Amino acid sequence: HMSIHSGRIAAVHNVPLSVLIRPLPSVLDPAKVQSLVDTIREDPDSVPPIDVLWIKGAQGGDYFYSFGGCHRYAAYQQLQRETIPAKLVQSTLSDLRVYLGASTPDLQ
């Protein structure tokens, strides 16, 4: 075998909900939110980590952007949880511009 696979680093962490930037509105099915609440209470390991873009700014500041995972995010909030399991996906400002376009911040 001549080759390896390489990609961005992703690691699951229990991230404080408060650190997550959520620039976009959520599209929520209220019954699906409640279903997740029930599942988180009874069987949390069956609820996957949400994906979060981990971006480092020009001066090394860390920013955690959350797009999607709307139902899980809402369900953790309704449970008043401090943290949520999240896959932190190392990403760039170019990756961020895909979601934020002209409003993409010059992050520091």
Ligand SMILES: Nc1ncnc2c1ncn2[C@@H]1O[C@H](COP(=O)(O)OP(=O)(O)O)[C@@H](O)[C@H]1O
């Ligand atoms: N009761 C549940 N209702 C919906 N999704 C669930 C439930 N329990 C576990 N899951 C898992 O959680 C993830 C939720 O994904 P999704 O339905 O796209 O909601 P969101 O991405 O908006 O949080 C899925 O991978 C699904 O398999």
